[PDB]
Structure formats: structure tokens, C-alpha cells
Amino acid sequence: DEATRRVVSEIPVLKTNAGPRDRELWVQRLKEEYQSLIRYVENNKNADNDWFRLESNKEGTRWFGKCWYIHDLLKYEFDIEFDIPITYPTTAPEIAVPELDGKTAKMYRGGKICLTDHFKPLWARNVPKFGLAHLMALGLGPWLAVEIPDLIQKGVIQHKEKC
């Protein structure tokens, strides 16, 4: 409940229960996604914690972006990607960070991140309120906060940009 509502309630809930096959309903959903993502990124910029950017193909089926992690004044950047499943928004998309594939146990084949036990049940009971913003906020962000410090310490991540 601490790692729940605390971080949800700043993100506006989504409404449309539609997936990438639902034609006119999907577009409505897609618009809600963009609105929620814009709102989240704004709140991030204001809290000085602008940690990710995302974008999609025209159909909104394929997402790609970058996230950022600051550790001891070093800034790290990682490419992210995911497809929207046909049964979305019932089924949560699977975020991949491909350049970290091989380096961490909390990952499946292809760089797909492995989430906390919270996530899958918590998503499942809120359908279709949670969207891509919630996926970032409760999925990728908590994951980065555990795994990136770990990989840094182990000396296995290549810092690419001077900060």
C-alpha cells in the first residue's frame, strides 16, 4: 500500500477498454495514453526527475524510448522498447532493455525486465485504469532503482555520457 497508491495517484487514470485491434476505440485509448504520458513527464520535469522519454509508430502498437539513471553524478542512458499486446489493456506490455540482456538475473530472454510480485496482480485488478504511464512508474522505474545500482557496483555497465 506504500509502494501502491503513493505513486499511482499522481498519474490520471485511463478509461477506454480497448486494444490495438479496436479501430475507433483504440484511437480513443491511444489519445488517453499520450495525455497520461505527457502529464507524467511534466510532473517529472517539475520534481526535477525527468527520467524517461517514449514514442510509438503511427498505429501506437510499437513503443521505443530511453530512460536515464543518475548515480554519484554519473548519468546512464538505456534504450527501451515494447509491443502492445492484442489483449491490452488487460495484458500489461513487456518492457525490454536490450543492452542489459545477459547482465542481470531479473530479466527474461530478449532483455525483458522481470517485475516485483506486486505488479502483475496490481495491474490485473485495475483494468483498464492503468496505462503506459503506470507501466513506467510502477514497472520500469522500481526495476531500474534496484538493478542499475547493482550492475554499477559490479562494474559491468559502460558509462557513455559525461555529466
Binding site: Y34, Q35, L37, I38, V41, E55
Partner: peptide, 14 residues
Amino acid sequence: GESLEDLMAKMKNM
């Protein structure tokens, strides 16, 4: 309000 194209631009140019 705004079209999908508008929203994509807004997200991008931010």
C-alpha cells in the same frame, strides 16, 4: 480538443 497527431508532437517536442 486535440488530435492524435497533436498529442504525438506534444510528447515528442518536450
